[PDB]
């Protein structure tokens with residue numbers, strides 16, 4: 001029904017190693033070459049990758065910006081409203097980014113902002129200019 | 134098994150069914166009702182038991198009925214019929230028994246039997262026992278043919294048959310109770326010893342053997358499932374198949390390596406693409422930090438757009454630091470997932486050079502079993518006789534097997550040194566023309582009703598013929614003779630003054646250096662009381678070694694042995710002999726095999742007798758005149774003593790039935 005355990009034997013494979021006198025050693029050569037031609041390709045890309053790693057040496061350590069820890073207030077200082085209007089100009093609807101920039105307003109206050117001051121900071125215009133980029 | 138059912142089994146018969154041969158002489162019973170069948174079977178078995186229990190004395194119709202019960206000793210035509218069948222076909226009272234009723238005084242019919250091998254002897258005994266006139270014609274100056282036994286001083290070793298292959302269903306079992314052969318069991322254990330002269334260690338010994346075994350099954354699967362039996366018209370041999378399998382095993386090893394590295398690259402290149410992304414981010418980062426730094430250095434107070442700039446760039450920078458942190462994450466995974474794959478490779482090779490060599494010894498062992506190059510055996514059929522193996526441990530005939538032919542020969546008309554040259558057979562009888570092997574111009578003629586031919590297949594094969602058939606054998610028979618295989622295997626007998634091997638070890642292998650010579654002295658037997666070693670020559674090697682001088686052979690022989698035991702534990706041999714069966718003109722080989730393109734069926738053709746054409750045209754169809762026995766004639770037990778012995782019984786039966794007529798068939 002099935003070959004012995006760990007003996008391998010396809011109908012297809014048999015017809016292959018018989019179809020002529022040396023189809024035998026022919027086929028074990030195409031593999032012997034297909035093999036070495038990959039073992040080599042490995043080293044090529046192990047070498048490529050080894051050098052691309054030596055560029056990433058040092059990490060991003062000299063570029064990392066210390067931890068800002070600040071209490072989410074609820075008042076909109078004029079300064080903050082101004083930061084806001086510009087964060088919109090630059091970021092569109094990304095409420096997280098705006099919130100990050102302003103520093104001390106949570107992702108929702110920001111959404112609410114969009115609705116209160118909508119009239120007086122022409123947030124329509126501002127948003128429609130952000131799109132044009 | 135045992136009881137009366139043991140007897141059925143120990144006689145090679147199904148205890149609870151009627152055989153085709155029984156259906157033949159009891160068509161009344163077998164086409165009858167199940168009830169009668171059981172009575173018959175019982176009678177049969179019970180009789181067998183009786184004979185078996187005590188085969189040193191004849192078992193008569195009386196003495197049988199004498200020992201039966203109701204409802205069985207009820208019908209006595211039945212009992213008499215049964216006993217008479219069993220007797221005719223040598224199931225009971227065969228071999229060497231004490232007769233109760235000294236021999237019926239005048240004989241009927243006359244038979245010439247060519248050759249006093251065991252097959253011939255066993256047949257003669259039966260026919261004489263059936264009161265017929267029998268004479269055997271032996272070319273050699275001794276009985277026993279391929280049962281040869283070297284004797285000198287206390288040295289005793291067979292150059293021919295040597296082992297009893299299990300007593301479980303073996304006619305020979307009976308014979309050994311009639312004849313004091315000394316039967317010693319053989320311990321299976323066989324330590325191999327590489328070319329260098331040192332043990333293959335348990336670790337390897339086991340892996341190779343086990344692979345060998347798997348390799349065989351593999352061919353079998355290949356044959357029955359994949360049906361790989363013809364290859365551009367020629368029948369596939371076992372040898373061929375073995376290669377095709379090894380080839381495929383080699384292939385898959387490669388196949389496997391290939392897709393393992395194929396897995397490394399696909400991953401070690403997902404990694405590249407990630408590192409590329411990672412550089413380019415570290416790039417944007419470097420420059421963004423600069424931008425932010427320059428925007429922080431504008432000391433305040435600042436207007437809001439310049440304050441926003443600091444803020445903007447600050448977020449923008451942490452955003453790109455989140456990313457190049459999740460990528461260094463990913464990077465770590467793919468980098469370990471790669472010490473992974475790269476640490477557990479698949480295997481380097483299917484089999485090493487030391488391996489392929491040890492596997493070769495296992496092939497030699499098989500070439501020995503079959504007396505032939507695996508490239509000659511039939512794929513589909515080489516093992517057709519496998520089912521009918523006896524059960525029990527193999528044995529050696531410690532006092533030399535010759536003791537059997539000699540026992541059988543006793544009482545018989547045997548003309549030794551008489552070489553048959555022509556067999557002519559006609560509607561009214563046969564004459565056989567033989568010569569004297571010593572002065573070969575000195576001629577003999579034998580007249581007879583029947584000729585039983587037990588000539589070895591090797592002989593029957595000769596071109597051109599050593600024995601002429603007149604008229605020629607029908608083509609259906611000669612094709613059988615061609616198609617069948619007749620191989621070769623040889624022995625070297627080493628006689629020393631002292632044991633220097635392991636007394637408790639019966640056989641030990643030597644591993645050759647090449648495929649080409651796996652057979653050469655590949656195996657040694659410690660079997661006898663005396664200090665004697667036996668060395669096999671099998672496979673392709675056997676044939677070639679026959680052209681080498683005895684000394685050179687005993688050369689390579691001692692060489693190997695020193696190699697294994699120490700260059701000075703191994704003395705010169707006191708007496709040596711070397712067999713050459715392919716050379717021997719009264720053998721022309723050693724025993725038969727199922728060659729590629731043959732089948733078990735050819736063996737049946739061998740046994741089929743020959744019936745001549747009519748004398749005067751339009752005269753009635755004649756009686757069959759020419760009959761065959763021999764190891765090559767018995768489908769289920771080729772190549773053996775017991776198998777020949779059996780073919781002898783067979784023919785004697787069939788001959789008597791024909792010539793003395795069968796009273797029991799009614």
Ligand SMILES: [C]C1=C([C])[C]=C2C(=[C]1)N([C][C]([O])[C]([O])[C]([O])[C]OP([O])(=O)OP([O])(=O)O[C][C]1O[C](N3[C]=NC4=C3N=[C]N=C4[N])[C]([O])[C]1[O])C1=NC(=O)[N]C(=O)C1=N2[C]([C][C]=O)C1=[C][C]=[C][C]=[C]1
Nearest residue numbers: 248250251252272278279294295296553719763764773774
């Ligand atoms: C060879 C061999 C060896 C070495 C070993 C062995 C064997 C073998 N086997 C087998 C047997 O032996 C056989 O089969 C038998 O014996 C056979 O018989 P037969 O059939 O009978 O035949 P032969 O014997 O041959 O005889 C015949 C006769 O004839 C004559 N001739 C010829 N020609 C002629 C004549 N005459 C006249 N004229 C003419 N022309 C001759 O001479 C003869 O005599 C075996 N078996 C068994 O059983 N056992 C054993 O052991 C054996 N061995 C084996 C192998 C197998 O495989 C073995 C070994 C080891 C282990 C196991 C087994």
